[PDB]
Write a protein that binds this ligand. Structure first.
Ligand SMILES: Fc1cnc(-c2c[nH]c3ncc(Cl)cc23)nc1N[C@H]1[C@H]2CC[C@H](CC2)[C@@H]1c1nnn[nH]1
Length: 161
């Protein structure tokens, strides 16, 4: 499958997936009905200012190796990948005031609403994703997008263009 999401072209290089309509609770305990893809899948993400290799299991990001134009371009690709992963911590990072999802679908699907939400401000997302201890050529990236050699956002690596 070769599809479009958040301005990136996704192309599956390994794995398979079946769909399942499921109910998810946000950090605001809001119920969203999402189309969950089940199975280990590997994708290329090709955009205009960033490219990445995404390794993912059902509602879990295994690894994301990002290459881009700059910190903003890479953060963008990172956000799309985290929303696409359908991970619980991404969903649970939807919390606050006005931070709700219009349940009549209309303009955007839940995945497109989650995306439009994290594009506005990724602080809660990146900060609620987690950090892990960390290879030459690939650096780690902290939730504030600072490159580090000792810690990175879980599963996230930044490769040189
Ligand atoms: F065509 C597609 C073919 N395959 C996938 C797909 C394979 N593995 C996956 N794992 C997680 C997710 Cl999130 C999707 C996938 N996704 C497609 N499109 C998705 C895709 C997300 C939302 C929109 C637009 C692009 C669209 C959709 N999601 N739910 N209904 N439609």
């Amino acid at each position: 499958s070769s599809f479009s999401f958040g301005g990136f072209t996704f192309k599956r290089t390994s794995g398979s997936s079946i769909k399942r309509e499921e109910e998810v609770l946000t950090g605001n305990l809001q119920t969203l009905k999402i189309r969950v893809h089940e199975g280990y899948e590997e994708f290329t993400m090709v955009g205009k200012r960033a490219t990445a290799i995404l390794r993912k299991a059902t509602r879990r990001l295994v690894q994301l190796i990002v290459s881009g134009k700059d910190e903003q371009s890479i953060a963008e690709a990172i956000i799309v990948a985290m929303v696409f992963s359908q991970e619980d911590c991404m969903i649970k990072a939807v919390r606050g005031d006005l931070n709700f999802v219009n349940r009549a679908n209309q303009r955007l699907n839940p995945m497109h609403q989650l995306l439009r939400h994290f594009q506005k401000d990724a602080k809660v997302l990146f900060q609620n994703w987690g950090i892990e201890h960390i290879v030459m050529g690939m650096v780690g990236v902290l939730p504030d997008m600072t490159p580090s050699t000792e810690m990175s956002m879980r599963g996230i690596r930044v490769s040189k263009m």
